[PDB]
Design a protein around this ligand. Structure first.
Ligand SMILES: CCC/C(=N/OCc1ccc(-c2ccc(F)cc2)cc1)[C@@H]1C(=O)CC(C)(C)[C@H](C#N)C1=O
Ligand SMILES: CCC/C(=N/OCc1ccc(-c2ccc(F)cc2)cc1)[C@@H]1C(=O)CC(C)(C)[C@H](C#N)C1=O
Lengths: 366, 366
């Protein structure tokens, strides 16, 4: 195995493939990148066993085929530390990989490419393309609502649901929920999968700002995304995800509208004086006005009053303020609508001007 | 106690008096800031007992004298979270402090200002003034060479020395040394003090880019710096410090000169393949050449060769590359000079074009 490539054709591919990978991944070969030369292409692969990232770079200079595995971080640091415009010559020599540029020479130890972890071939069942921007939307809008290390492994992930001509994401906690759907201009079978925590991260990470569309393929136990010359594959989470349709409030006929930024700053200042563990705030809704109060064990107290649009009956409702701020932070819009039923029922929050996404939050007893 | 102040007049002083790496209190009252209104000025004071930071803010609106102490981080978060241009009215009310602006109200818990730790009055013995830029130069030039938790506790600080019309800093950890002197245009007594690590941190963080000069006063056991309406005071470290003059190599009659950036990048690449704990690299110097090699336990190896200016005898010398890189990063010059004696003696490194700062590093046996 040999190749010579310009440093700058190596930088992004390298950064993109080291994104997976554990902490001494306890499996040391997981700290290595699999390098493969075949045809006129160098392929770079990283994996953490659950997912795998692959980049292709075209070889215009003379090359010889073969494969090896090298420590990912060190090979990246070498390449990155060389001067702009450096030509990097790489050759596999016995149990070492030799890198030379200019009058700099480096030998890295290798692990055999035969030993590198290989996700099994699988069959795609649903395939679609969509703008990168739309995947970013769908992820941003819901990520913050996934569980973290919940016993219910499937809540630690994000549901991806194809339905009609839309792709939808759904994330929940057991306490708060987010869902977002976006039209994609393709007629799709109905299909639901759960993408793990690390895999949604990696998906997001692949997105770059350019005109490369995202090409997706889903199988029974895998998802794959291809943008440009990178391809990301993840295992799926095997469990049944709750139905968002069952979670959305049934009869939320009391509707409050308010400026997003004023609401979020009023909640953010109150939070300062809410209990650091439980974060409870109390909302008093009355004609055209909202009052937010917070208190803590030290007996400290905040109160915020703002003008809002509200015609229904007066009610008092407690919320974990972090749940509320998370939603208001992800909405990024002029005005917000909160849809309320009673003091004992969940509330729905969305952009006053869009039904793309919906957030549901369980009130707190208090 | 009562005052009304514009928010943007509180923001900077608040930030300056809340002095970082003390996130974990000790005594509770230490987590509070001391507010005092007297003679038309609000004074705000933070302390960890070893040091104290005081800001004064002129009060043009009606105000009423008195003092209290409030949770530092909460009062800051409250003021910062209010809207641009907010007027903040504060009044002390029982065992609570009432903060109100617009239609936001807050009540914070207090502890008696009578209880707040006082640092005792002490008398200055040396006083001088000097530009912030020159204090910044002095600290950045040497700070990185301070010890961390060495048993020889005086090494964990920085020496500030007045001599002639210069102020000098020195820092050393027993393995490497930095010294920097800058002229200050005042004739001063010869005097030496050790500033503790946290005090040098606070001295640096009070430098703002402005041309409020530092007014410095040193007593037997304390240092004080006054910049604008901010006054910082620290205990001194009571011990005797190594004489740098001792440590400077006897006479190093082999001089190597090289471009700083080319040298630092060759060392930075090599270090990748050095031992992660001991970080040894070898230097072979030869007519107009330097060769740097590194290896690690897995038997990986880096070589760098570059052109330099060098006429003396060939030599091999081993160094901890992190020490060497620290120096090259702190010198921010075009060319550097290394001053060598033999394989078992320390090297001195400086700007080839300036003698302002000197760095001494002891060789390692590889
Ligand atoms: C064996 C699977 C058990 C289930 N697991 O779902 C976990 C789960 C439960 C509740 C929420 C939730 C989210 C937001 C909210 F405002 C109120 C509740 C989110 C997730 C069911 C479920 O699938 C239907 C359900 C209506 C979500 C039901 C409730 N409540 C359940 O507990
Ligand atoms: C009781 C005094 C303890 C001492 N403490 O100093 C600790 C100390 C020792 C060595 C260094 C040092 C710094 C740079 C270097 F290249 C080589 C050595 C820096 C500090 C003495 C000292 O003050 C004079 C001395 C020549 C630095 C001597 C040595 N070597 C000492 O050990």
């Amino acid at each position: 195995m040999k190749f010579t490539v310009e440093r700058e054709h190596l930088l992004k591919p390298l950064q993109q493939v080291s994104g997976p990978l554990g902490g001494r991944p306890t499996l040391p070969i997981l700290g290595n990148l699999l390098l493969q030369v075949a045809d006129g292409t160098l392929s770079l692969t990283g994996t953490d066993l659950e997912m795998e990232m692959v980049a292709r770079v075209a070889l215009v200079q003379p090359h010889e085929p073969g494969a090896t595995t090298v420590p990912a971080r060190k090979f990246f640091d070498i390449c990155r530390g060389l001067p702009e415009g450096a030509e990097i010559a790489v050759q596999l020599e016995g149990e070492r990989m030799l890198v030379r540029s200019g009058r700099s020479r480096f030998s890295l130890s290798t692990l055999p490419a035969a030993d590198f972890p290989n996700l099994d071939d699988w069959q795609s069942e649903v395939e679609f393309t969509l703008p990168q921007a739309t995947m970013k939307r769908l992820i941003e809008a819901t990520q913050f609502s996934m569980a973290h290390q919940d016993v219910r492994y499937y809540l630690n992930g994000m549901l991806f649901e194809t339905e009609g001509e839309e792709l939808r994401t759904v994330a929940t906690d057991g306490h708060r929920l987010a869902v977002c759907s976006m039209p994609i201009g393709q007629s799709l079978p109905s299909h639901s999968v759960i993408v793990p925590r690390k895999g949604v991260i990696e998906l997001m990470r692949m997105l770059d700002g350019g005109d490369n569309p995202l090409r997706v393929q889903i199988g029974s136990n895998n998802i794959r995304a291809h943008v440009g010359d990178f391809i990301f594959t993840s295992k799926l989470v095997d469990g049944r995800f709750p139905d968002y349709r069952r979670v959305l409030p049934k009869n939320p006929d009391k509707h409050l509208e308010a400026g997003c930024d004023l609401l979020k700053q009023a909640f953010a200042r109150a939070a300062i004086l809410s209990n650091e563990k439980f974060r409870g705030v109390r909302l008093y809704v009355s004609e055209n006005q909202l009052k937010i109060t917070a208190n803590n064990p030290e007996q400290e107290e905040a109160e915020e009053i703002l003008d809002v649009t509200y015609s229904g009956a007066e009610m008092e409702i407690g919320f974990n303020v972090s749940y509320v701020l998370d939603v208001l932070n992800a909405l990024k819009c002029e005005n917000v609508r909160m849809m309320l039923t009673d003091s004992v029922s969940s509330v729905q929050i969305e952009d006053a001007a869009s039904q793309s996404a919906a957030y549901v939050v369980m009130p707190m007893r208090l």
